[PDB]
Amino acid sequence: ERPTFYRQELNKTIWEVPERYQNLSPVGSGAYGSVCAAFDTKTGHRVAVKKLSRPFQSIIHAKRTYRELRLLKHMKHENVIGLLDVFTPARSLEEFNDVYLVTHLMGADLNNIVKCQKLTDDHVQFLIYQILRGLKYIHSADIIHRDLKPSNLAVNEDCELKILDFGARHVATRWYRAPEIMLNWMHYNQTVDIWSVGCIMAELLTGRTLFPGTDHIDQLKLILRLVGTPGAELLKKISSESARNYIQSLAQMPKMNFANVFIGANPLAVDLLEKMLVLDSDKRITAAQALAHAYFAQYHDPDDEPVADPYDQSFESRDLLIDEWKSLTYDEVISFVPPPL
Numbered sequence: 001e002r003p004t005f006y007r008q009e010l011n012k013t014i015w016e017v018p019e020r021y022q023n024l025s026p027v028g029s030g031a032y033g034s035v036c037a038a039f040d041t042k043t044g045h046r047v048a049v050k051k052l053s054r055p056f057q058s059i060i061h062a063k064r065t066y067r068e069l070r071l072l073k074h075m076k077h078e079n080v081i082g083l084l085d086v087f088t089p090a091r092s093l094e095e096f097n098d099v100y101l102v103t104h105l106m107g108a109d110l111n112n113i114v115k116c117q118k119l120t121d122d123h124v125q126f127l128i129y130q131i132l133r134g135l136k137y138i139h140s141a142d143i144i145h146r147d148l149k150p151s152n153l154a155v156n157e158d159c160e161l162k163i164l165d166f167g168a169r170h171v172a173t174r175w176y177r178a179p180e181i182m183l184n185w186m187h188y189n190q191t192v193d194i195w196s197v198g199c200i201m202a203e204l205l206t207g208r209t210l211f212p213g214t215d216h217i218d219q220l221k222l223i224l225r226l227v228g229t230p231g232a233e234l235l236k237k238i239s240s241e242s243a244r245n246y247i248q249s250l251a252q253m254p255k256m257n258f259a260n261v262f263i264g265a266n267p268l269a270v271d272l273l274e275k276m277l278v279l280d281s282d283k284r285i286t287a288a289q290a291l292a293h294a295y296f297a298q299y300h301d302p303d304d305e306p307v308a309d310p311y312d313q314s315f316e317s318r319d320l321l322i323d324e325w326k327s328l329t330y331d332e333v334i335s336f337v338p339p340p341l
């Protein structure tokens with residue numbers, strides 16, 4: 001089989017999709033793409049359709065299309081965005097130049113669902129548990145999110161949450177960023193995603209952004225004032241002289257009393273936060289560890305927290321030319337096989 005398409009301009013952009021999907025309605029766009037809500041007539045479902053902006057405009061563009069198609073094809077978890085479909089109108093490699101991605105429309109992000117804010121301990125518990133559950137899977141594939149933030153979480157009105165790996169507004173990235181990755185570090189880790197999860201949690205229990213820096217310099221100042229200036233041990237792990245100084249040069253920040261800052265809320269929540277917002281990535285709790293913690297007693301089930309199949313990202317090392325990335329991508333478009341009902 002090979003479907004028939006129809007073009008239209010969802011302002012000011014042109015869309016070329018199988019007749020399968022109807023009622024294409026714009027829902028947002030960034031620099032790397034445009035999404036539309038729509039109805040999958042096959043399954044009778046509502047879906048999100050993403051048209052990538054110019055997938056192969058450059059080497060940098062080429063490899064990221066590829067990166068995106070590859071991760072999305074790999075992700076099969078209820079807490080992580082995956083692919084229902086992927087298509088192109090082209091009929092040969094020769095004319096390949098557009099890529100479309102299909103997934104379950106969620107219709108909003110955490111932000112979009114949460115404001116004005118401060119929800120019951122109960123919803124926080126549930127939202128964060130879904131995030132730690134999807135993160136468990138992703139990390140288990142040897143993948144680091146690194147861009148975890150509210151606008152990177154897709155939530156529907158049933159409060160079900162999915163992590164999207166690529167996807168801002170319509171959040172301010174450095175507000176959610178592990179300190180280590182605002183210092184040029186490192187041979188750092190997975191637990192940078194744990195920092196952000198802590199940052200999101202704080203704001204949900206609190207109704208306000210934990211660390212709304214104005215820049216990377218400010219950002220660190222606010223982080224330090226909560227968590228305090230670094231132990232001499234941590235210090236010794238820092239090779240970056242300039243990093244050491246910036247730190248070593250501050251008010252000697254005392255570690256603040258979580259209890260007092262946070263907030264009148266569930267002492268379990270706070271003791272978990274305590275464990276997520278650590279200066280040392282080496283000492284930060286892990287997705288899986290975080291899931292087995294008292295705070296999520298009513299949601300936590302160890303035999304329903306799957307981990308992923310291994311993912312080859314050896315491609316990340318390579319340096320190919322646009323055409324090779326492009327044909328790589330196409331090959332993956334060609335080979336895609338759809339999910340089961």
Ligand SMILES: CCOCn1oc(=O)c(-c2ccc(F)cc2)c1-c1ccnc(Oc2ccccc2O)n1
Nearest residue numbers: 027028048050101102103105106107108109154167
């Ligand atoms: C436009 C804001 O976010 C878009 N988001 O980034 C993406 O990149 C995709 C995306 C779409 C298709 C795909 F195959 C993969 C990702 C979606 C996406 C995925 C699923 N549902 C929705 O619905 C939303 C609508 C408005 C606001 C937030 C939403 O979550 N978006």
